[PDB]
RNA sequence: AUAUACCGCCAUCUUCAGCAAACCCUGAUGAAGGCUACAAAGUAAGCGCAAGUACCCACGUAAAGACGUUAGGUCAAGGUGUAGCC
């Protein structure tokens, strides 16, 4: 009879209301709609993109909305069912930002030399009976020589679902909710932190309100 | 089990052939979140390629009427001591100042550039 | 390259003791000695047969409690009470351990016409310092 | 008789630093390969150097120096397979 409080949220569509935490007007102060130039630009990442102004490239604020509803929708729900949600950056100006974000959570961060077969050689590298994280939230899915990062492939590999801020030089290719956005201003990024922030410290909320409701009938 | 085969398909096709084969005895805590809520695109891998011929993006440029006589307006009069702020919503620059007075006059009534030009330099120097 | 008492590294998986993994540079820095007699200091006469009584007594006992002395035997001999101090191991009974015991405890005293005495420590497995 | 069957005990590179179980990734899942600390897939038990010991110091000298190389040296130190003599 637990299948209530873990099949409810499932046929609620938007069971957290977290479509009043994010507006095109919002995004568009935040800068998410400025990208890079058509010279850096990814063939995958075209369907995603407005257009260009002065060689500059913009992304499409309303595709950037509703893949932002179904990301945090997810994420509200991993986080509603308890799962490990892990932030992958490797951006330098914002690493105190994301792993202050996963202490203000209780989730995990990491933002920094990813080692090879973290999320694959696992068993070996931490221990025999390690949960790996059931989601990942890529805020920044390049390196930082400009390629996409190792976690993307490995979580694929490793059928981790994975949300991503994918900017005009990315590869929105093997990332489960790609959320089309700028991740090079401070404003875009601590806006994608506000909002994660949010979802899943209120999931997590919820969840301890109906397991309270349910024990107490 | 598992598949590490990332370039086959998805992670949701993956795990559902293997759930329904009997092979993941327990599903995944994120399969029915998909389920439910599935994403535009499946994550199935693509290569990327480059475009050989006449193929070309169908990104285009952004050009608006004003920008005519935006370019214009450079031109003659260049870019005053009157910075841009850009840090705040509803700037108003001076260009902006002379592209409104000269739409102006355009849904009024008048016709030749070159005497909406004079005429709404004369507006502006009042 | 030097090979007199040092136990090669297989693979991984050869089960060894602290006696056979030390090498002959380690021959009183780590390990120490199996047998204790005095013959050995400055001013002796009869070390030469009590090595050679030596290591009679360590292939006797060897093929006497055969199959069962886990490592090397310690042949102390303080006045002329001989002593063969064991480790042997826990597979055979001990009425025959006994038996043994009685069989040495006797035949090397009138073999070397002095106290013999056994003081077996029975061990379960046979012990292993380190896996080369 | 065969060191070209060997144990044993050594020479040599070595007045070296490598040898590596087990995994993982890359190469359209080929022989193979796995580097960037403002970091791009490598993680590593174990042996070796190192460390600790001997001599007068922490210096120097000793010892030590793996995996393998050279069918390198010895059936004659001893033991010994194979073939032989009685
Ligand atoms: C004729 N060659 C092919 C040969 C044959 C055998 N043994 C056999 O084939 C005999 N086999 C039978 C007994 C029939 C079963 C051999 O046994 C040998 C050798 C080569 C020698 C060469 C030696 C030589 N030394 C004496 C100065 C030399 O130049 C070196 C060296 N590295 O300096 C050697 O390698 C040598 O010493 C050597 O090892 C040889 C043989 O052992
Ligand atoms: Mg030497
Ligand atoms: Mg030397
Ligand atoms: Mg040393
Ligand atoms: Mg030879
Ligand atoms: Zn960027």
Known sequence: ?217 | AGSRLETVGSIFSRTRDLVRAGVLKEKPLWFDVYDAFPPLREPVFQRPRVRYGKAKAPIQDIWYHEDRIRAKFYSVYGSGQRAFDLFNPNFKSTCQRFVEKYTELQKLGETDEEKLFVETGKALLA | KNRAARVRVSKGDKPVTYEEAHAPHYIAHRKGWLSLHTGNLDGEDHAAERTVEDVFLRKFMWGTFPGCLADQLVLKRRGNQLEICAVVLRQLSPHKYYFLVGYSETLLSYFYKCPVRLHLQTVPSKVVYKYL
């Open chain 1, 1 to 217: 009879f637990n299948d209530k409080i873990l099949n409810e949220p499932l046929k609620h569509s938007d069971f957290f209301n977290v479509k009043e935490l994010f507006s095109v007007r919002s995004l568009f102060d935040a800068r998410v709609h400025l990208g890079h130039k058509a010279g850096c630009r990814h063939r995958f990442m075209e369907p995603y993109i407005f257009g260009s102004r002065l060689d500059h490239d913009i992304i499409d604020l309303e595709q950037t909305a509703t893949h932002l509803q179904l990301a945090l929708n997810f994420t509200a729900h991993m986080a509603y069912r308890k799962g490990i949600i892990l932030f992958i950056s490797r951006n330098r100006q914002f690493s105190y930002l994301i792993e202050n974000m996963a202490r203000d959570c209780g989730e995990y961060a990491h933002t920094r030399y990813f080692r090879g077969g973290m999320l694959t050689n696992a068993r070996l590298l931490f221990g025999p009976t390690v949960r790996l994280p059931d989601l990942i939230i890529f805020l920044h899915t390049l390196n930082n020589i400009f390629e996409p990062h190792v976690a993307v492939r490995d979580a694929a590999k490793m059928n981790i679902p994975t949300v991503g801020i994918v900017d005009t030089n990315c590869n929105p290719c093997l990332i489960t909710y790609p959320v089309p956005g700028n991740d090079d201003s401070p404003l875009a990024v601590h806006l994608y932190c506000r909002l994660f922030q949010t979802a899943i410290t209120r999931a997590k909320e919820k969840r301890q309100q109906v397991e309270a409701l349910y024990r107490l009938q």
